[PDB]
Design a binder for this molecule. Structure first.
Ligand SMILES: COC(=O)c1cccc(NS(C)(=O)=O)c1
Ligand SMILES: COC(=O)c1cccc(NS(C)(=O)=O)c1
Lengths: 265, 264
């Protein structure tokens, strides 16, 4: 892992592991989403962070994931080397964006790409707020000035509105709880666990005959360690599409909503 | 990753990741148990395996974990490089053994060690075999001839009998189910998930004040993807615990073990 020549992006190589692959001997979307988080942490570490800035630590402010969009063309096989390139960008007072390009090391061909929107939140009160000017200057020196998009297209599927799943759901996975492996160093549930929870409602037949091409996720609430979750799914559609919804088992408080696109293997 | 000079052991270096560490900024025992499995897979791959031998493929025979014993002295911190060395050994017609030595790359100091016993089983049915002579010759060319033990000590912790937890348990974690991330490429539940399930019954106070030094696990049954598990724990004492994993319904035993925790 190292920053590029300009110092405005970061590149890292990963060798895919035996326990990281699914039934097709290729990496899982959660392994990819874990690898994207790792290269993002190493990019923040390489530029002097611990991605809280000096003003964010002083004000008890943190960056939380508002949205995650991943598109995979080829899943790296067990033993393959996957090069991931990541970079950050400001989106005015709304928040920040982090993009990724996944490539095969051998061929140099783009095998995937991801984009994520992050919102500013007070760590203690959980109150979202706009980005102040003092914080925007602290990270503008590590971001490209001109716009660099992983999903540039005028009608890209990364900025699409997601509706709320109506009851009854076609498919469901009830009683999902996080374990200590699902928590980060600060004891909050890892963002990758919600993705794995969304896909639990998808039937095994769809997984055994299709491959996940696109996954968009909107994060609305934080799941505590002692919380219980319900994954809900309804087909909205060669290609199969789904509407997803994660909610607490009790009250049904919405924690997540998203869409998945699957293609025939 | 590469085999040593003699070709009878395998060494690999791992850089610890952000998502692999716990609340103490050091690797978790499950991350270590995952890393041990990875270096074992790479050791088997480096010597021509798909650790199934040629006569094992034709007979529909696989190696299953009967026991796992891990002892950690220092958990590698986030960003640290951990060198793991692994090797296999035959234990006559009883089965095979795989050992590991964990070291810090910078200092070269031993930060942990592990040992595991594996039994031969028919993949189709669940009948444990006693290892034939045709299989012994196929893997004796990749094993040291003289005994090389990670836990050599006469009458040590790794070969201790484990009793069955009596009801009522002091602590419990009920309704544990595996997700698709908890399964391997063959759709069976990863053996690391049972370790994570054993530790779910341990109270958060013990985790926040102690560090897991030793973990011994005896595997009795496989957990299917559609099965529901119950983790049970009782303090037997440094703090020691007696653990038991069983199916939610009938209470069929799937696992039993013991843990040792030192004050941070
Ligand atoms: C716009 O974001 C929110 O409303 C929000 C609120 C709470 C949490 C999150 N994200 S997460 C990764 O902690 O689940 C987003
Ligand atoms: C002696 O071992 C057994 O009886 C046995 C039976 C079934 C399974 C296992 N282990 S595992 C890792 O496949 O869950 C051991």
């Amino acid at each position: 892992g190292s920053l590029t020549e300009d110092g405005l992006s970061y590149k890292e190589k990963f060798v895919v592991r035996s326990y990281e692959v699914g039934s097709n001997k290729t990496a899982t979307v959660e392994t990819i989403a874990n690898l994207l988080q790792e290269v993002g942490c190493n990019h923040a570490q390489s530029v002097g962070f611990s991605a809280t800035t000096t003003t964010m630590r002083k004000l008890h402010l943190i960056w939380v994931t508002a949205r995650m969009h991943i598109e995979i063309y080829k899943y790296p096989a067990w033993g393959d080397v996957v090069e991931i390139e990541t970079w950050c960008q400001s989106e005015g007072r709304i928040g920040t964006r982090r993009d990724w390009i996944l490539k095969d090391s051998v061929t140099g061909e783009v095998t995937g790409r991801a984009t994520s929107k992050w919102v500013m939140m007070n760590q203690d009160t959980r109150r979202l707020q706009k980005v102040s000017d003092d914080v925007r200057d602290e990270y503008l020196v590590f971001c490209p000035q001109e716009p660099r998009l992983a999903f540039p297209e005028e009608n890209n599927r990364s900025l699409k509105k997601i509706p709320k799943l109506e009851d009854p759901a076609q498919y469901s996975m009830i009683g999902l709880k996080p374990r200590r492996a699902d928590l980060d160093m600060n004891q909050h549930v890892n963002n990758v666990t919600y993705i794995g929870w969304v896909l639990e409602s998808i039937p095994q037949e769809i997984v055994d005959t299709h491959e996940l091409q696109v996954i968009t996720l909107d994060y609305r609430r934080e799941c505590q360690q002692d919380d219980v979750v319900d994954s809900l799914t309804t087909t909205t559609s060669n290609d199969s599409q789904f509407l997803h919804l994660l909610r607490l088992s009790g009250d049904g408080q919405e924690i997540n909503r998203g869409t998945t696109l699957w293609r025939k293997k």
